[PDB]
């Protein structure tokens, strides 16, 4: 009776969302932006290629510099890069092999990573003794770790495949929140610029906004035919991308609170694993399961570029925060630096 | 034209290489086994004989290290994380024969059996495991031959129609599995029969993976 | 804590020989290139001999290549430095000094007690050799360089050093402008192509002492004369 009550309710809640996001629908993103011209052929050349992982390499996380690069690999390895000249400064070996994500501290003293092993470590890159040593193993999450990033020294957000998301104080080594709502397992999150705001992609073909502070969810978005498996934040932050499972990229607007565009292609069939923008956010590039990375006109819906460089599926990728170099890693256990030339 | 730091910065990049590959190699000679297999089918009595989120296990036969990797306590989406392991060496997969006249405790419908094959035949036709031996591992065979001579495996085959004896009844279930196999050219599935008292159940995953060893020797080699 | 320990040293007769041993302690000794320099009684640092992580790349100064050896024994953490044939340009004392190379790290940032040894080329140029100061007032220490110390690269390889008196030199400021990690931040660090500077805001008493300039653009280091505050 109540039960049965409450249920219909939620039924009408969920069509008074949807009409109230046809009603503001006036317009769509093709139609404002078919005006512009397209962005043409993006061409990007492998200007650096990261050797020395060992195993299929699972995610890859720039420093704030543009220069140093974290990435992560199943063959029990965390390898710092200098992409300039391909020196590796740093080798941290994992207690964990099956290591999913991996992370960068925006002040560049810390790395983060976890995996199947449910665990979130923090590894402190400036020492005394001159070693990476592990700071932190963050225990609360019971499923695997999917995503991780830093707010601060002392603040990481992770997801996991237990549905939820949880805010962690370092120090201390307590989750300070927990983020719940989502049905499955969650894949990715992405920080908004001014870390206020967090958004995260779930195996429910979800997407929810999150306020950090207060802890609960502001926003869901629909959309997505099967599993989110990447997310990112567009470079204003009022903006996101998801890919999923069904060859299909879309961008959520948070103030619209709709789906504003699709980014697929009849010969797309395969899986999207990670997806990026550029500097502007004109570009989208995501990485898929064919063993290629396509680059995206935001806006448009084209498909400008491909990076075809790798012999197995492209699993993470990253542009720099000055926008020069883009990095992708690879099940091949390769990582390349992609920039054009004039 | 690389300075002082430069060149000494080159040299310890030089100096991680020469403990990666160090690391890279030790590693290449181990051997890294997938435990799978439903509740109560004898998955822990295996690693009892073999002795967070994943529970890793190693040991040491005949000179070859084993790492068997058990991820019964990940209760989230199986597709997800299964092909974190695209690359080991064999999975093990225990089956209980014992378990084909009950039902499973939470649908009360569906047979324990039945959700044994669905599950082997989402890992053995799993993409990521097209060239990934499985070892079928057919447990508690002893209670089978007692539960065959009072209830017959009518119940859960219905096309069966054999005698009703363990020498008869058990070579069926076998095929059944192998029967799944939609792949019979990429791979194969070594099937054995387990007791709780059984010495030879960590001989025969040494011979399957000896095998598997031979046949990626075969692909680097050239020769395949 | 981090610690190096120097011993062997001693008097020692003209044309003998002398081993001096550095036991390291408190970080990862394998991991990290070291040096020595040495310091003549009432005269600068000298630059003697250095050796890379795992031993593969060794330097030495000329004015003792051929006779002192380098070695270290990253098992035990203890660095050697093996001298033959003593002159009496030897009498010194002879620092340990580590320094790691990655990128953004700092070299030089942690030296020895250092050990007495008595006996029976770019040009870092240091001419002010005093400067009277007071307390709370701003001071600038000015090093000269007789090539170019910006690589093209974009790093300017000079280094400070404050040895206070009684102290191990300590590091202040690696390439020019880096502050070295543990020091206040009233030090700074300015210069452009052979013309550097070296600013003290809101000077202390303990920044009594004399600053030392080094280059590390290529081998031999070589140190400046060496500017000291008295008040």
């Known amino acids: 009776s109540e039960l049965d009550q409450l249920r219909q309710e939620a039924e009408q809640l969920k069509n008074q969302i949807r009409d109230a996001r046809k009603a503001c629908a006036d317009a769509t993103l093709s139609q404002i932006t078919n005006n512009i011209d397209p962005v043409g052929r993006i061409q990007m050349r492998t200007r650096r290629t990261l050797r020395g992982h060992l195993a299929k390499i699972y995610a890859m996380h720039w420093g704030t510099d543009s220069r140093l690069l974290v990435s992560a690999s199943q063959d029990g390895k965390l390898i710092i890069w200098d992409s300039y000249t391909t020196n590796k400064v740093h080798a941290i070996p994992l207690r964990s092999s099956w290591v999913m994500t991996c992370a960068y501290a925006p002040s560049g003293n810390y790395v983060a990573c976890g995996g199947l092993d449910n665990i979130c470590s923090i590894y402190n890159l400036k020492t005394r003794e001159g070693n990476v040593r592990v700071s932190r193993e963050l225990a609360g999450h019971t499923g695997y770790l999917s995503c991780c990033r830093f707010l601060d020294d002392n603040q990481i957000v992770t997801s996991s495949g237990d549905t939820t998301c949880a805010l962690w104080d370092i120090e201390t080594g307590q989750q300070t929140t927990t983020f719940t709502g989502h049905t499955g397992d969650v894949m990715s999150l992405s920080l908004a610029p001014d870390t206020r705001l967090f958004v995260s992609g779930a195996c429910d073909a979800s997407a929810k906004l999150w306020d950090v502070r207060e802890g609960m969810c502001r926003q869901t978005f629909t959309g997505h035919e099967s599993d989110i498996n990447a997310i990112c934040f567009f470079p204003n932050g009022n903006a996101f991308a998801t890919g999923s499972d069904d060859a299909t990229c879309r961008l959520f607007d948070l103030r619209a609170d709709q789906e504003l565009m699709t980014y697929s292609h009849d010969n797309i069939i395969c899986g999207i694993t990670s997806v990026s923008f550029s500097k502007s956010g004109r570009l989208l590039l995501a990485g898929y399961d064919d063993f290629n990375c396509n680059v995206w006109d935001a806006l448009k819906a084209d498909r400008a570029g491909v990076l075809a460089g790798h012999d197995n599926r492209v699993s993470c990728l990253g542009v720099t925060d000055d926008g020069m170099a883009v990095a992708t890693g690879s099940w091949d256990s390769f990582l390349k630096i992609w920039n054009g030339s004039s | 034209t690389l300075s002082a730091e430069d060149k000494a910065a080159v040299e310890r990049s030089k100096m991680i290489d020469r403990n990666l590959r160090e690391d890279g190699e030790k590693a290449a000679r181990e051997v890294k086994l997938l435990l799978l297999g439903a509740g109560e089918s004898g998955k822990n009595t295996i690693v009892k004989q073999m002795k967070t989120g994943i529970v890793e296990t190693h040991f040491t036969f005949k000179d070859l290290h084993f790492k068997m990797f058990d991820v019964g306590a990940q209760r989230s989406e199986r597709k997800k994380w299964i092909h974190c392991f695209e690359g080991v060496t064999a999975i093990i997969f225990c089956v209980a024969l014992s378990d084909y006249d009950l039902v499973l405790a939470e649908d009360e419908e569906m047979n324990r059996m039945h959700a044994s094959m669905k599950l082997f035949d989402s890992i053995c036709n799993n993409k990521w495991f097209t060239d990934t031996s499985i070892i079928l591992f057919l447990n508690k065979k002893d209670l089978f031959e007692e539960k065959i001579k009072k209830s017959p495996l009518t119940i859960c085959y219905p096309e069966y129609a054999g005698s009703n004896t363990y020498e008869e009844a058990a070579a069926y279930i076998q095929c059944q599995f192998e029967d799944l196999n939609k792949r019979k050219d990429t791979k194969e599935i070594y099937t054995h029969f387990t007791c709780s008292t059984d010495t030879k159940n960590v001989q025969f995953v040494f011979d399957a993976v000896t095998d598997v060893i031979i046949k990626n020797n075969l692909k680097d080699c050239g020769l395949f | 804590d981090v610690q190096l320990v120097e011993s062997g040293g001693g008097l020692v007769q003209p044309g003998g020989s002398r081993k001096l041993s550095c036991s390291a302690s408190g970080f990862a000794f394998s991991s990290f290139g070291m040096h020595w320099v040495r310091q003549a009684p009432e005269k600068g640092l000298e630059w003697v001999a250095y050796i890379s992580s795992g031993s593969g790349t060794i330097y030495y100064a000329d004015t003792v290549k051929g006779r002192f050896t380098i070695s270290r024994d990253d098992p035990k953490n203890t660095l050697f430095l093996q001298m033959t044939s003593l002159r009496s340009e030897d009498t010194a004392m002879y620092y340990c000094?580590?320094?790691?190379?990655?990128?953004?790290?700092?070299?030089?940032?942690?030296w020895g007690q250092g050990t007495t040894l008595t006996v029976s080329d770019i040009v870092m140029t240091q001419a002010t050799s005093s400067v009277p100061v007071t307390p709370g007032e701003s001071v600038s220490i000015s090093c000269r360089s007789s090539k170019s110390l910006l690589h093209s690269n974009g790093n300017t390889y000079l280094y400070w050093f404050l040895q206070r008196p009684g102290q191990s030199p300590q590091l202040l400021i690696y390439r020019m402008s880096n502050l070295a990690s543990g020091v206040p931040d009233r030090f700074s660090g300015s210069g452009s192509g052979t013309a550097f500077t070296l600013t003290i805001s809101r000077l202390e008493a303990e920044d009594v002492g004399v600053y030392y300039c080094m280059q590390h653009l290529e081998y031999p280091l070589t140190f400046g004369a060496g500017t000291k505050l008295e008040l």
């Open positions: 000094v580590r320094s790691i190379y990655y990128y953004g790290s700092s070299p030089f940032d942690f």
